[PDB]
Design an enzyme around this catalytic site. Structure first.
Site, PDB file in Angstrom:
ATOM      1  N   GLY A 155     -44.772  11.429  67.230  1.00  5.43           N
ATOM      2  CA  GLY A 155     -44.790  10.270  67.166  1.00  5.43           C
ATOM      3  C   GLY A 155     -45.442   9.229  66.070  1.00  5.43           C
ATOM      4  O   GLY A 155     -46.310   9.488  65.362  1.00  5.43           O
ATOM      5  N   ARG A 156     -44.720   8.053  65.620  1.00  5.70           N
ATOM      6  CA  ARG A 156     -45.340   7.134  64.707  1.00  5.70           C
ATOM      7  C   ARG A 156     -45.622   5.884  65.503  1.00  5.70           C
ATOM      8  O   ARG A 156     -44.994   5.218  65.921  1.00  5.70           O
ATOM      9  CB  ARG A 156     -44.347   6.824  63.390  1.00  5.70           C
ATOM     10  CG  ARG A 156     -44.733   5.759  62.526  1.00  5.70           C
ATOM     11  CD  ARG A 156     -43.793   5.531  61.768  1.00  5.70           C
ATOM     12  NE  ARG A 156     -43.270   6.466  60.642  1.00  5.70           N
ATOM     13  CZ  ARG A 156     -42.125   6.528  59.883  1.00  5.70           C
ATOM     14  NH1 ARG A 156     -41.245   5.654  60.206  1.00  5.70           N
ATOM     15  NH2 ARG A 156     -41.851   7.576  59.269  1.00  5.70           N
ATOM     16  N   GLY A 157     -47.001   5.488  65.154  1.00  8.05           N
ATOM     17  CA  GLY A 157     -47.365   4.233  65.626  1.00  8.05           C
ATOM     18  C   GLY A 157     -47.502   3.208  64.519  1.00  8.05           C
ATOM     19  O   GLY A 157     -47.354   3.448  63.347  1.00  8.05           O
ATOM     20  N   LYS A 158     -48.017   2.003  64.509  1.00 14.87           N
ATOM     21  CA  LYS A 158     -48.360   1.024  63.699  1.00 14.87           C
ATOM     22  C   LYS A 158     -49.236   1.443  62.621  1.00 14.87           C
ATOM     23  O   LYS A 158     -49.269   1.131  61.509  1.00 14.87           O
ATOM     24  CB  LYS A 158     -48.669  -0.176  64.328  1.00 14.87           C
ATOM     25  CG  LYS A 158     -48.699  -1.552  63.270  1.00 14.87           C
ATOM     26  CD  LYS A 158     -46.968  -2.092  63.291  1.00 14.87           C
ATOM     27  CE  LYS A 158     -47.129  -3.137  62.329  1.00 14.87           C
ATOM     28  NZ  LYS A 158     -48.473  -3.862  62.493  1.00 14.87           N
ATOM     29  N   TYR A 159     -50.166   2.399  63.314  1.00 10.74           N
ATOM     30  CA  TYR A 159     -51.476   2.432  62.271  1.00 10.74           C
ATOM     31  C   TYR A 159     -51.444   4.419  61.909  1.00 10.74           C
ATOM     32  O   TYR A 159     -52.514   4.526  61.234  1.00 10.74           O
ATOM     33  CB  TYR A 159     -52.740   2.350  63.265  1.00 10.74           C
ATOM     34  CG  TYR A 159     -52.712   0.845  63.250  1.00 10.74           C
ATOM     35  CD1 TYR A 159     -52.816   0.082  64.814  1.00 10.74           C
ATOM     36  CD2 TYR A 159     -53.026  -0.016  62.471  1.00 10.74           C
ATOM     37  CE1 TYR A 159     -52.936  -1.101  64.700  1.00 10.74           C
ATOM     38  CE2 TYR A 159     -53.154  -1.487  62.228  1.00 10.74           C
ATOM     39  CZ  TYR A 159     -53.185  -1.838  63.730  1.00 10.74           C
ATOM     40  OH  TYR A 159     -53.301  -3.378  63.913  1.00 10.74           O
ATOM     41  N   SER A 160     -50.755   4.922  62.469  1.00 11.49           N
ATOM     42  CA  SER A 160     -50.623   6.242  62.164  1.00 11.49           C
ATOM     43  C   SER A 160     -49.408   7.207  62.495  1.00 11.49           C
ATOM     44  O   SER A 160     -48.564   6.644  63.199  1.00 11.49           O
ATOM     45  CB  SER A 160     -51.908   7.043  62.957  1.00 11.49           C
ATOM     46  OG  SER A 160     -51.825   7.134  64.312  1.00 11.49           O
ATOM     47  N   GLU A 161     -49.246   8.172  61.997  1.00 13.42           N
ATOM     48  CA  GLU A 161     -48.385   9.426  62.641  1.00 13.42           C
ATOM     49  C   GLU A 161     -49.105  10.506  63.123  1.00 13.42           C
ATOM     50  O   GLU A 161     -50.003  10.968  62.659  1.00 13.42           O
ATOM     51  CB  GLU A 161     -47.448   9.928  61.355  1.00 13.42           C
ATOM     52  CG  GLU A 161     -46.652   8.925  60.733  1.00 13.42           C
ATOM     53  CD  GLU A 161     -45.191   9.640  60.225  1.00 13.42           C
ATOM     54  OE1 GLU A 161     -45.484  10.159  59.357  1.00 13.42           O
ATOM     55  OE2 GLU A 161     -44.070   9.240  60.516  1.00 13.42           O
ATOM     56  N   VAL A 162     -48.549  10.803  64.545  1.00 11.50           N
ATOM     57  CA  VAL A 162     -49.174  11.923  65.028  1.00 11.50           C
ATOM     58  C   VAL A 162     -48.393  13.256  65.249  1.00 11.50           C
ATOM     59  O   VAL A 162     -47.133  13.302  65.336  1.00 11.50           O
ATOM     60  CB  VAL A 162     -49.362  11.527  66.583  1.00 11.50           C
ATOM     61  CG1 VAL A 162     -50.300  12.432  67.241  1.00 11.50           C
ATOM     62  CG2 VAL A 162     -50.069  10.160  66.497  1.00 11.50           C
ATOM     63  N   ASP A 206     -57.943  -0.721  74.444  1.00 15.07           N
ATOM     64  CA  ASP A 206     -56.305  -0.497  74.283  1.00 15.07           C
ATOM     65  C   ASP A 206     -55.911   0.589  75.290  1.00 15.07           C
ATOM     66  O   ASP A 206     -55.242   1.276  75.207  1.00 15.07           O
ATOM     67  CB  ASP A 206     -55.971   0.251  72.785  1.00 15.07           C
ATOM     68  CG  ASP A 206     -54.390  -0.086  72.662  1.00 15.07           C
ATOM     69  OD1 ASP A 206     -53.743  -0.755  73.528  1.00 15.07           O
ATOM     70  OD2 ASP A 206     -54.018   0.560  71.594  1.00 15.07           O
TER      71      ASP A 206
HETATM   72  O1  LIG Z   1     -49.719  10.922  70.514  1.00 10.45           O
HETATM   73  C1  LIG Z   1     -50.889  11.063  70.592  1.00 10.45           C
HETATM   74  O2  LIG Z   1     -51.528  10.366  69.870  1.00 10.45           O
HETATM   75  C2  LIG Z   1     -52.991  10.590  70.030  1.00 10.45           C
HETATM   76  C3  LIG Z   1     -53.908   9.637  69.198  1.00 10.45           C
HETATM   77  C4  LIG Z   1     -55.261  10.235  69.179  1.00 10.45           C
HETATM   78  O3  LIG Z   1     -56.314   9.232  68.440  1.00 10.45           O
HETATM   79  C5  LIG Z   1     -55.954  11.373  69.770  1.00 10.45           C
HETATM   80  C6  LIG Z   1     -54.788  12.168  70.360  1.00 10.45           C
HETATM   81  C7  LIG Z   1     -53.621  11.926  70.356  1.00 10.45           C
HETATM   82  C8  LIG Z   1     -52.673  12.725  70.803  1.00 10.45           C
HETATM   83  O4  LIG Z   1     -52.658  14.014  71.426  1.00 10.45           O
HETATM   84  C9  LIG Z   1     -51.475  14.513  72.119  1.00 10.45           C
HETATM   85  C10 LIG Z   1     -51.132  15.668  72.797  1.00 10.45           C
HETATM   86  C11 LIG Z   1     -49.778  16.017  73.225  1.00 10.45           C
HETATM   87  O5  LIG Z   1     -49.443  16.901  73.575  1.00 10.45           O
HETATM   88  C12 LIG Z   1     -48.688  14.706  72.761  1.00 10.45           C
HETATM   89  C13 LIG Z   1     -49.017  13.553  72.010  1.00 10.45           C
HETATM   90  C14 LIG Z   1     -50.440  13.525  71.695  1.00 10.45           C
HETATM   91  C15 LIG Z   1     -51.304  12.503  70.849  1.00 10.45           C
END
Ligand SMILES: O=c1oc2cc(O)ccc2c2oc3cc(O)ccc3c12
Length: 328
Positions: free
Chosen positions: A44-51, A154
């Site tokens: 996923g992509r948030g406003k502050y990072s991509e995960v 948050d």
């Molecule tokens: O979306 C995330 O954002 C994060 C942000 C953080 O600062 C730390 C961990 C996570 C994190 O761990 C996961 C594990 C999964 O199986 C799926 C999604 C995530 C997910």
């Protein structure tokens, strides 16, 4: 002006820590080897990072990689220091490494992998026992970071990763978290709309750990009443009105009067007058199996206008609502 406020617990924890602990601006990041990790898929992509989901090829283990979007090295060091401070704590997501991403030219935080199913389907299948169990687990996380002088700011279903199969829980995304210092004024533009505490909505800046407890209350309300989100405002102003239609306007005025706060005058033609409601009002045949007198009293003690009047995380764990939960 506004009346000052202090946290009723863990008030001086950062005051008596070495300055190394809370002075995150002076923190020196220790970098790992970025080649240790291979990205597998984007989560996923948030406003502050991509995960991303990734693999640490030095042990063939799954990890989570959070590549930060360009932002103040202010906020980057803040999240990093907080994560290292809280590492090892109950149900806190574990920071395994920090590497420099060659493409984004930004830090990439490496976390322990936890197997999550979304909150949307999961919250529809949660039993009464499951809700109490997972609430207790969150409280462990909240009490720990609060005891370590840190507020999350948050708390929401998105930031609570649940492995329902192994019944494991992790509190994540500490990118908005901060150190609590007595008398310090903070940014009110934190948390997500539905989970913003009244202190944020009336722009009271001298808040504390208790902010997290309102957010937790919002989550609980959404779970036991099966209404997500519970307070469903269209904007930050309608959000306060939504809350006022349940907690009543008179206690709202009591609140701002106590701290000598003035409401935004744009509330004058939208706030109206509302009585405080009894929580039974939200009980119906489809959620009543999730509701108990204990559940409502606990919820009631979390959702208070006055941040100083809400249960602390520790007090919350003492509540009869958690008596039926099997302890370790
Ligand atoms: O979306 C995330 O954002 C994060 C942000 C953080 O600062 C730390 C961990 C996570 C994190 O761990 C996961 C594990 C999964 O199986 C799926 C999604 C995530 C997910």
């Amino acid at each position: 002006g506004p009346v000052p406020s202090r946290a009723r617990v863990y008030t001086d924890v950062n005051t008596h820590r070495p300055r190394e602990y809370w002075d995150y601006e002076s923190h020196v990041v220790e970098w790992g080897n970025q080649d240790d990790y291979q990205l597998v898929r984007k989560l996923g992509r948030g406003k502050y990072s991509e995960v991303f989901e990734a693999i640490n090829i030095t042990n063939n283990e799954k990890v989570v990689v959070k590549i930060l979007k360009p932002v103040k090295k202010k906020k980057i060091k803040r999240e990093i220091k907080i994560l290292e401070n809280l590492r090892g704590g109950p149900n806190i997501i574990t920071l395994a490494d920090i590497v420099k991403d060659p493409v984004s030219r930004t830090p990439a935080l490496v976390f322990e992998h936890v197997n999550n199913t979304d909150f949307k389907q999961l919250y529809q299948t949660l039993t009464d026992y499951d809700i109490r169990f997972y609430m207790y687990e969150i409280l462990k996380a909240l009490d720990y970071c609060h005891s370590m002088g840190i507020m999350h700011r948050d708390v929401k279903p998105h930031n609570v990763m649940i492995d329902h199969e192994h019944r494991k829980l992790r509190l994540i995304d500490w990118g908005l978290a901060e150190f609590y210092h007595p008398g310090q004024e903070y940014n009110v533009r934190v948390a997500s709309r539905y989970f913003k505490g009244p202190e944020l909505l009336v722009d009271y800046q001298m808040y504390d750990y208790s902010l997290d407890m309102w957010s937790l209350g919002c989550m609980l309300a959404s779970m036991i009443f099966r209404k997500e989100p519970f307070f469903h405002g269209h904007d930050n102003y309608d959000q306060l009105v939504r809350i006022a239609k349940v907690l009543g306007t008179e206690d709202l005025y009591d609140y701002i009067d106590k701290y000598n706060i003035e409401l935004d005058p744009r509330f004058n033609d939208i706030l109206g007058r509302h009585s405080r409601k009894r929580w039974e009002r939200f009980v119906h045949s489809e959620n009543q199996h999730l509701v108990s007198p204990e559940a409502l009293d606990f919820l009631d003690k979390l959702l208070r206008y006055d941040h100083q009047s809400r249960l602390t995380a520790r007090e919350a764990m003492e509540h009869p609502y958690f008596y039926t939960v099997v302890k370790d």
